[PDB]
Amino acid sequence: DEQQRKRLEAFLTQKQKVGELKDDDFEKISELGAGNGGVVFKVSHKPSGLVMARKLIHLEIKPAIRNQIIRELQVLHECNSPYIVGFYGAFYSDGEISICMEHMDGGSLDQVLKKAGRIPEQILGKVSIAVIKGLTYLREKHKIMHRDVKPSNILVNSRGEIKLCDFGVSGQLIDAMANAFVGTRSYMSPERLQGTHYSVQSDIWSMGLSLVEMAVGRYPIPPPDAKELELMPMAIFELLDYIVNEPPPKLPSGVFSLEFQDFVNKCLIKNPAERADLKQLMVHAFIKRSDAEEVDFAGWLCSTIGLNQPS
Amino acid sequence: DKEELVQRAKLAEQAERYDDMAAAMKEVTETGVELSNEERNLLSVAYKNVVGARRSSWRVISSIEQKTEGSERKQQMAKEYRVKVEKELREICYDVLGLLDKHLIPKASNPESKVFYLKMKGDYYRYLAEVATGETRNSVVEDSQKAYQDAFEISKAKMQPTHPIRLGLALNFSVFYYEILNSPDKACQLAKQAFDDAIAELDTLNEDSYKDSTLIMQLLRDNLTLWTS
Amino acid sequence: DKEELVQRAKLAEQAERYDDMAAAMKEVTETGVELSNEERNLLSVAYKNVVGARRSSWRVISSIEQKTEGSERKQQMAKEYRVKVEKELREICYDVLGLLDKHLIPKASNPESKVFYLKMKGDYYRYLAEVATGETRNSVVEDSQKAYQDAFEISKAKMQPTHPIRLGLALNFSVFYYEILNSPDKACQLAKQAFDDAIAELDTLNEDSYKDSTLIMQLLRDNLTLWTS
Amino acid sequence: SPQKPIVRVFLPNKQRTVVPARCGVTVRDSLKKALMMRGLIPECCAVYRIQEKKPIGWDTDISWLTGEELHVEVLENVPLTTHNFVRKTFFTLAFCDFCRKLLFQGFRCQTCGYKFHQRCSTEVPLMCVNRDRSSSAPNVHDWEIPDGQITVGQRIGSGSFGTVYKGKWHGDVAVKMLNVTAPTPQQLQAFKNEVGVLRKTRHVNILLFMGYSTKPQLAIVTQWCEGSSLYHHLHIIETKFEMIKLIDIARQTAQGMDYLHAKSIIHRDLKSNNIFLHEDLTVKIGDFGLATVKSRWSGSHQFEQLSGSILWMAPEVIRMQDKNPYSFQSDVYAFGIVLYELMTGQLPYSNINNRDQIIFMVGRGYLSPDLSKVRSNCPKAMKRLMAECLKKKRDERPLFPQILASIELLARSLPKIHRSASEPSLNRAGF
Amino acid sequence: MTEYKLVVVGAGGVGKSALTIQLIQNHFVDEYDPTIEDSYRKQVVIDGETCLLDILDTAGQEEYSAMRDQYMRTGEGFLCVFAINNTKSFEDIHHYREQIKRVKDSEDVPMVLVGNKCDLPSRTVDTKQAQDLARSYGIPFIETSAKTRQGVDDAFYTLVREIRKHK
Numbered sequence A: 001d002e003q004q005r006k007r008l009e010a011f012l013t014q015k016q017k018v019g020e021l022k023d024d025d026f027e028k029i030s031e032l033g034a035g036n037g038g039v040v041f042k043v044s045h046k047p048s049g050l051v052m053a054r055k056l057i058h059l060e061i062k063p064a065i066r067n068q069i070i071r072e073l074q075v076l077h078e079c080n081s082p083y084i085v086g087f088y089g090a091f092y093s094d095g096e097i098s099i100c101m102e103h104m105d106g107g108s109l110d111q112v113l114k115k116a117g118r119i120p121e122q123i124l125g126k127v128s129i130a131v132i133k134g135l136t137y138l139r140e141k142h143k144i145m146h147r148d149v150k151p152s153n154i155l156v157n158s159r160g161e162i163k164l165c166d167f168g169v170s171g172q173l174i175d176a177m178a179n180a181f182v183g184t185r186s187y188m189s190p191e192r193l194q195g196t197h198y199s200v201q202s203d204i205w206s207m208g209l210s211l212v213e214m215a216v217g218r219y220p221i222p223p224p225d226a227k228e229l230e231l232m233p234m235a236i237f238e239l240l241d242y243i244v245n246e247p248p249p250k251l252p253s254g255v256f257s258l259e260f261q262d263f264v265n266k267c268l269i270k271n272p273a274e275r276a277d278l279k280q281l282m283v284h285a286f287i288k289r290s291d292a293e294e295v296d297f298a299g300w301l302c303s304t305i306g307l308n309q310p311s
Numbered sequence B, C: 001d002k003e004e005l006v007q008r009a010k011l012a013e014q015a016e017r018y019d020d021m022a023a024a025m026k027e028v029t030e031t032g033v034e035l036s037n038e039e040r041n042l043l044s045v046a047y048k049n050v051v052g053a054r055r056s057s058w059r060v061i062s063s064i065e066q067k068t069e070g071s072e073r074k075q076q077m078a079k080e081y082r083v084k085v086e087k088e089l090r091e092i093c094y095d096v097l098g099l100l101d102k103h104l105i106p107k108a109s110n111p112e113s114k115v116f117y118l119k120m121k122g123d124y125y126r127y128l129a130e131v132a133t134g135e136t137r138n139s140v141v142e143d144s145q146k147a148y149q150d151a152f153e154i155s156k157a158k159m160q161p162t163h164p165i166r167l168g169l170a171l172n173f174s175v176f177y178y179e180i181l182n183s184p185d186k187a188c189q190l191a192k193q194a195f196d197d198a199i200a201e202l203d204t205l206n207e208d209s210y211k212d213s214t215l216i217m218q219l220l221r222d223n224l225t226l227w228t229s
Numbered sequence D: 001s002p003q004k005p006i007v008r009v010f011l012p013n014k015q016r017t018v019v020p021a022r023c024g025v026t027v028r029d030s031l032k033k034a035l036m037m038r039g040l041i042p043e044c045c046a047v048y049r050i051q052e053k054k055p056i057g058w059d060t061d062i063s064w065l066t067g068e069e070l071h072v073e074v075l076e077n078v079p080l081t082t083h084n085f086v087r088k089t090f091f092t093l094a095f096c097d098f099c100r101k102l103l104f105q106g107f108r109c110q111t112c113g114y115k116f117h118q119r120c121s122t123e124v125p126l127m128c129v130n131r132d133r134s135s136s137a138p139n140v141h142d143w144e145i146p147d148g149q150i151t152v153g154q155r156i157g158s159g160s161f162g163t164v165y166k167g168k169w170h171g172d173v174a175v176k177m178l179n180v181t182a183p184t185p186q187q188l189q190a191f192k193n194e195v196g197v198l199r200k201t202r203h204v205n206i207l208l209f210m211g212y213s214t215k216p217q218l219a220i221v222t223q224w225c226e227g228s229s230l231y232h233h234l235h236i237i238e239t240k241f242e243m244i245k246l247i248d249i250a251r252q253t254a255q256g257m258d259y260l261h262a263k264s265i266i267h268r269d270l271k272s273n274n275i276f277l278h279e280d281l282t283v284k285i286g287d288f289g290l291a292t293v294k295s296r297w298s299g300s301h302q303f304e305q306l307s308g309s310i311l312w313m314a315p316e317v318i319r320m321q322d323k324n325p326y327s328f329q330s331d332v333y334a335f336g337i338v339l340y341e342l343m344t345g346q347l348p349y350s351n352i353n354n355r356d357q358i359i360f361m362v363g364r365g366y367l368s369p370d371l372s373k374v375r376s377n378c379p380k381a382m383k384r385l386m387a388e389c390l391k392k393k394r395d396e397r398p399l400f401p402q403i404l405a406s407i408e409l410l411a412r413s414l415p416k417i418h419r420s421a422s423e424p425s426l427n428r429a430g431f
Numbered sequence E: 001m002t003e004y005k006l007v008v009v010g011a012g013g014v015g016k017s018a019l020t021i022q023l024i025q026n027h028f029v030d031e032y033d034p035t036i037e038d039s040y041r042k043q044v045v046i047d048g049e050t051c052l053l054d055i056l057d058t059a060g061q062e063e064y065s066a067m068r069d070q071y072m073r074t075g076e077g078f079l080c081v082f083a084i085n086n087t088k089s090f091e092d093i094h095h096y097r098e099q100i101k102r103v104k105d106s107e108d109v110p111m112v113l114v115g116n117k118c119d120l121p122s123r124t125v126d127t128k129q130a131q132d133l134a135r136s137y138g139i140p141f142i143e144t145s146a147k148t149r150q151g152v153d154d155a156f157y158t159l160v161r162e163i164r165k166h167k
């Protein structure tokens, strides 16, 4: 709209003020989070005064592959959407790949979910809207697919924005990522565990698998116990075997409306083609309803984190 | 009497003692008795293993000789030990070649056996060509060229291209071209021709001839794959 | 010079030839100088492989002799070949014993070397025991018994329960008990006691001998499992 | 329709099967198991697509054929290879490939190198895939560093259970800040007990373990290695070496692992990252054991949450369904993947752009290291060892006493066997 | 001389394929590779008759029931398999029998009830339940373990005998 265009243009304006990205141009302010393969810091770019997030991935790869990754990561300069985290520049130094993005002071939805215990359906509606619009922008404007949709990659700020990040834009970077340490849980759609990406359908499952996890405050595989649900250590290979050979998870009986439950069930179909696409979800009853609702996302976020109300 | 010596040769083969089998077969062929298939195959295996063990020993000795040249006169005795090994290598091949000159070649009433004996002569000449250097190498290889060229014709004219003896002859000739004359393109072309001819004429073999020919063809495929790269 | 002879012996060992190696080490021992730790292993390996080839030949020949089960001259010739290879093995073992009891055993400062050489003496007396059937068997059997008891006293006195030499002596002694004397109860008792005592000091395993220790341990376990059935 | 893009396959003798049409999988591998159940092998068969019967290559990517019907037939062509068994006495240390016991006398396949006792002939593999005398004696051939001593220097890099720094402690050492920063009094005790064992290891191929330090959290102190790791020399610079040095590296790694297993220490982490070339000559394995500092505890239990590059984890380790998956055979599988990495120069599964996909398919027994990327001169005996190390069932994998011996057996026969083949001896066998 | 078309049906995971592979090759598969379709031939002597068995091993996953139904239409007799640790698979024997009646357009179809996985601990479908269900349909009940091979031949041979009775 108008405010989104304003913010995008202001981000571009603040982006032109940044030239070459040198390692000496950053002063480390704080740590923001860490995963199994990278560490992110909030830092200040001295030459331009801006404050950004800097992800550092430490890969032991040959210099040619590293350079091709660096070159491929420059496509992120084209991604300009209110549902995609802003990108300032990527480079390599001191044996680590550094990716510079805009700072989301609200954090990722995993941290917000940990702070909140559970997330209300009404908030989840706007979250799903943003996720779907970001996936649409990635599928249409760039013909690339996220492939790593989960609460750890959905970011939010104090201005009520909800943006996607950590999507698969550099194929060589994914190829390097295939030599990673085993995680504790997977959001991979069942077809990807036996075949290859079935287009954006393979992303949508993850979103659903995320929403339920945010809907209940618990990793939904295996589904909660009979009395753990009323209270409202599986091996990773066992989780994958459950994902492939067991019925998908579902929302609780009566805690959530039927449109949200139908949305998540359509999002969690084990057959990707029978599973809904972006256009189906965009005009879903739950999506229409949550788009009609005037939910105060920024204030709810600030409240949950423990900061004073914004605006 | 003959059967007693053949039984002794078989018993020596089972006992892994090979020099006794070599002697017991040389004394059998010394008489000039009609040599059948198994009787000559025992001789072939005996004279193959006896020379093969010493050839492997010579290869190891030569490899150790060239491990480190920047050293004292420890290589001095190494080459003299190798010379002794050759002194115990060439003369047995000469005992085989003289034997082939005595009885085998004249007392042959079947072209297949003639091809077999000529291939053996060529194989032992190729065995001698490795250690022999200078003009002796040339003098040795000039005999093996004709030994194989007087056998390939008979193989092509009297026996099928799928015959295990013809396949063995082609394999040995390709190895001779590759290792001695160092013409890898001609060796590859010869091997490809033999293998394509074998494939073009297949599924006609006997029931017994379903292991050995396959073995030679699989070794041919291994060599072709090794020489392509 | 001794180093030239030792290098020649090692070179022949790397060439998989065990006739020049045995002669070279016999010439080394004939000098009458005390061997080092390294030089002894080459002698042991050479005079083990030389006997081992004849042992394999003898085993397979006796198997064929027990397989034929007929009435002809094949059995008589097989018996003649068996007595020939038995005479050859007797000559080898007698040469080893003559080279052992005149230059090494009487001059052995290190008790460890004494245990090694008494183990070898018992091993070759057992090698002679398994072939010679008759009245002479009781002499060599008792000689091996005396040698092994003498080695075992020193092993119990001044040896480690995890040393390769003590474990090898115990293994050879249990095999001697089981095969020659046919008393498996005491063989099992000895094997279990030795295996337990080797289990005792399991932590004390330096780099010098970990492969030999665990290999003899596993061989003892395999023999124990074979004999307890 | 595609129904999980499947392919329908018609088989000999009126049989049939459905296989998943997954990108990146060959027809051969899609069908391997179905054929095996019927005593068939792709190499003894032909495959066709219906279009009407048109021949396709066994190495075709099956995902191109989704929705199609394939047919597999035989033509009774080359019978793979028949075992050329020669009776041989082994004057050197040899083990029977079936029974893993000492093999003083037996049979050897001239082509494929398989070795077995006379008594085990009923257990020999059928296709040559390219009262007895009891055995005898074979041939003969407080550790806590206090504060104020470890000069922690420059950060080197983070791992799967800690970050490594180059420290100064009576010379250059490698300090490791273990991720487990707050250990319980039981985990600390178990870690001290594990260090008790690790301090008593001294081998030329094993990195020296110089204790730890408790005051500044937990910090394993190991011998600092100069030069670079094997992974660095195999995937960063891609400096391939002659086969002799490669087999020597494999032999030294196997010797170090054999020393580790002789003392009953499961490495749990053997991979090209933990293999160093000390002065470009000596192989040194590091980061072994330390089972108690991985999989952070919640009490007196140490449920292994599993952590490490899954490329080297055995299928039994990937499953984690077993009570304890880090046994000797999982170490052997890790070594086998190291052998594959050394031999081909590429990491396993160089055609997959997902990590969870690899975990699922490997732990499921569907994905295996492809053995069609090897060099065109590797002796078949050597390659057979690598294929034995990567057996899905862990009980089939050999132990390191056998692997070291098998490596050394072909280490000496390398130069002679590199020349072209020759006319072999005929059958000369019978059972 | 005599060919018999046998169809193995029942819920996912109960051991249909493991039972079939034990019959065909005397080997237990411990992996769980879900079936879409698999057919086998095996020649066997049963009651003095050399029999050619066509074994049609079907999918337990209902997603592939269209393929299952094509196999069922050709079959002459049915092994209806449940697992002794899966009560729903036991209850759903009724579903499979109804499917057979539907596809065969007949209430008179040779059938044998098989309770598999009897080697497991903590069995939850008891012998009385299973025998009562078999009795309710007038069919034999055979306990099996594809792991130990107990009952495998009896299950298939009994079905062949039921087909012979029906012929």
Ligand SMILES: Nc1nc2c(ncn2[C@@H]2O[C@H](COP(=O)(O)OP(=O)(O)NP(=O)(O)O)[C@@H](O)[C@H]2O)c(=O)[nH]1
Pocket (backbone or CB within 6 Å): E010, E011, E012, E013, E014, E015, E016, E017, E018, E019, E029, E030, E031, E032, E033, E034, E035, E036, E058, E059, E060, E061, E116, E117, E118, E119, E120, E144, E145, E146, E147, E148
């Ligand atoms: N312990 C045990 N496991 C068994 C037995 N029979 C099958 N299984 C196991 O159960 C799993 C499923 O077996 P399978 O034969 O594939 O079952 P299915 O009924 O054919 N499944 P689907 O309907 O999907 O084709 C496999 O892991 C198999 O090893 C048995 O008798 N005992």
Ligand SMILES: Nc1ncnc2c1ncn2[C@@H]1O[C@H](COP(=O)(O)OP(=O)(O)OP(O)(O)=S)[C@@H](O)[C@H]1O
Pocket (backbone or CB within 6 Å): A032, A033, A034, A035, A036, A037, A038, A040, A053, A055, A085, A101, A102, A103, A104, A107, A108, A111, A148, A150, A152, A153, A155, A165, A166
């Ligand atoms: N742009 C960002 N701004 C602020 N924090 C961020 C940003 N990107 C990532 N983070 C933090 O880093 C973590 C998520 O990033 P990653 O660690 O890369 O993802 P992850 O948790 O490792 O899961 P993955 O990517 O599926 S392996 C969270 O703790 C976030 O708070």
Ligand SMILES: Nc1ncnc2c1ncn2[C@@H]1O[C@H](COP(=O)(O)OP(=O)(O)OP(O)(O)=S)[C@@H](O)[C@H]1O
Pocket (backbone or CB within 6 Å): D156, D157, D158, D159, D160, D161, D162, D163, D164, D174, D207, D222, D223, D224, D225, D226, D229, D269, D273, D274, D286, D287, D308, D309
């Ligand atoms: N003993 C050592 N001496 C010298 N450098 C070392 C040593 N151990 C590790 N390193 C270095 O540390 C870097 C990364 O740290 P590590 O944690 O050892 O990596 P890692 O081996 O992948 O981790 P794990 O736990 O073994 S999977 C490697 O690239 C090595 O260069």
Ligand SMILES: O=C(NOCCO)c1ccc2cncn2c1Nc1ccc(I)cc1F
Pocket (backbone or CB within 6 Å): A035, A036, A037, A038, A055, A057, A085, A087, A099, A101, A148, A164, A165, A166, A167, A168, A169, A170, A171, A173, A174, A177
């Ligand atoms: O970040 C990644 N994986 O997580 C690290 C493991 O801890 C990641 C994974 C795949 C990928 C392909 N192309 C870039 N890729 C990534 N990077 C990345 C992408 C977009 C944004 I906006 C920010 C990023 F950091």
Ligand SMILES: [Mg+2]
Pocket (backbone or CB within 6 Å): A035, A152, A153, A166
């Ligand atoms: Mg992330």
Ligand SMILES: [Mg+2]
Pocket (backbone or CB within 6 Å): E016, E017, E034, E035, E057, E058, E059, E060
């Ligand atoms: Mg099935």
Ligand SMILES: [Zn+2]
Pocket (backbone or CB within 6 Å): D082, D083, D084, D109, D110, D111, D112, D113, D114, D127, D128, D129
């Ligand atoms: Zn073979």
Ligand SMILES: [Zn+2]
Pocket (backbone or CB within 6 Å): D096, D097, D098, D099, D100, D101, D116, D117, D119, D120
């Ligand atoms: Zn055996």
